[PDB]
């Protein structure tokens, strides 16, 4: 078609709508959106007015983690009894005010020193199940060396999280990032996927944001979305940022981004790669835009 109903109808594809939280915020367990814990979806739609309210973080290679968690389509989480013996658990930040009390991410455990000492953690959580599982951890970058020696009883913090397949190593750097939400520090969030029969081992001398369990990563037909359209109640399957599109005509002009079996976009009147960007990253963005330009031109000529 060339016009849209103007809303994202909730059937037959189940729609989880983040009124103020981005998918990564709900995954990390923002107190702002505690209702999103352990929820499942077929399409996750993010309003452009979303914002963060907990500890100001950043994700190294945010795009792939975002896409992986979106394609998971399931936020089911299992608490795991990690053996944090010589360290103190449940570090609570002031910025993440949950229930009129200082708190932190519901799925992350800020470990600090116990008895003014932080032993070199070496913990094992083997996978004895029959399914692939995903762990998410982080490294906190303090604003000053004082804020590091206060937290972990040693300046030279580092971490290595390894599986039988590969290893990952993170070094934290001390330095005041420009202040956001009156906090100069940083949190960097990573992830590690442990296959069935694999073993997860955490070996850190300090400066760790431990995981409280594992997420159930599964292959699925879910996806990710970014739009400001309201939620409707109709039954048209296709979903577009401008609304919804019944498949009355084999082509459409509403928007390139789409979900479901939908008419193809042309110049003339499930899960996919991104088609809109906020920044300029480089060569990869040019390639992922040129492929869409080529597809649009070829389908324009084929029509």
């Amino acid at each position: 078609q060339n016009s849209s109903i103007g809303e994202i109808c909730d059937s037959p594809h189940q729609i989880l709508d983040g009124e103020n939280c981005t998918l990564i915020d709900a995954l990390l367990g923002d107190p702002q959106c505690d209702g999103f814990q352990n929820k499942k979806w077929d399409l996750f739609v993010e309003r452009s007015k979303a914002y963060s309210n907990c500890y100001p973080y950043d994700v190294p290679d945010y795009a792939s983690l975002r896409s992986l968690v979106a394609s998971s389509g399931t936020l089911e989480f299992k608490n795991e009894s990690f053996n944090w013996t010589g360290v103190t658990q449940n570090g609570t930040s002031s910025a993440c005010i949950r229930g009129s009390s200082s708190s932190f991410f519901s799925r992350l455990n800020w470990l600090t020193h116990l008895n003014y000492t932080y032993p070199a953690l070496n913990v094992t959580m083997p996978n004895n199940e029959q399914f692939d599982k995903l762990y998410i951890w982080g490294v906190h970058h303090p604003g000053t060396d004082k804020d590091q020696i206060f937290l972990y009883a040693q300046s030279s913090g580092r971490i290595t999280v390894s599986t039988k397949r590969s290893q990952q190593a993170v070094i934290p750097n001390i330095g005041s990032r420009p202040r956001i939400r009156d906090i100069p520090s940083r949190i960097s969030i990573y992830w590690t996927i442990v296959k069935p029969g694999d073993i997860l081992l955490i070996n850190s001398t300090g400066n760790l944001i431990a995981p409280r369990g594992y997420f159930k990563i599964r292959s699925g037909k879910s996806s990710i979305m970014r739009s400001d359209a309201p939620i409707g109640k109709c039954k048209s399957e296709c979903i577009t940022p401008n609304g919804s599109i019944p498949n009355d005509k084999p082509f459409q002009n509403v928007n390139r981004i789409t979900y479901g079996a939908c008419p193809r976009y042309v110049k003339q009147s499930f899960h996919q790669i991104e088609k809109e960007f906020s920044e300029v990253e480089g060569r990869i963005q040019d390639l992922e835009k040129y492929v869409e330009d080529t597809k649009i031109d070829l389908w324009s000529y084929n029509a």
Partner: antibody
Amino acid sequence: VQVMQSGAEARMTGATVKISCKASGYTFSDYFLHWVKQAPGKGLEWMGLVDVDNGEVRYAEKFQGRVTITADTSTETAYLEMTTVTSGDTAVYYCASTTPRGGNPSVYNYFFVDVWGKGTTVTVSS
Amino acid sequence: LTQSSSASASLGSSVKLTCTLSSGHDNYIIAWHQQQPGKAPRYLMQVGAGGTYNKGSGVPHRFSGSSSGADRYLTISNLQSDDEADYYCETWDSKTVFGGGTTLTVL
């Protein structure tokens, strides 16, 4: 940074007293302010710790219940008031500002004092 | 945690102060605060378990800390004139546990 206390005045036995403190020099508004009693000839005795950023108020075993401590977070000040003050409470109450947390999870070290108030003398007459 | 007795020394000499923990704690960090008579106090030091101490802003270099196990020490490199005062040690965070103070005098 600077911490100053409000000038006190003489009170009578059985009346009530009020003490005000404010530091405002730290650029986080997330710092703790202690309360320490010191009668002349005595040592420092802790009575409570106030979180100016939120509603957290702490107490010691000998001052729980009898003493109520508040803090106006909007103006970032801390107040201390007592009921039926006795003649023996003629002393100095000290408010000490801690290192601002700045979002950190308030480990053992963050509750230390580092700057003391100027000090005010509360006197109770017979 | 526990207090210590008062100290005195001649002008130009060196003096030391002590503040000790209970058997239940060995690695706890203490502080050091100074209080002149008829004057408001002034924070001056923090002492750790591993023989290493932390300093605040404006603290003098004339004072140097120490630790030799379950006890913490302060050392005045040199003291002259009307410099003596009281010295206290906070050793906790849940309670601002002061030992009781140590009084310094000249002779």
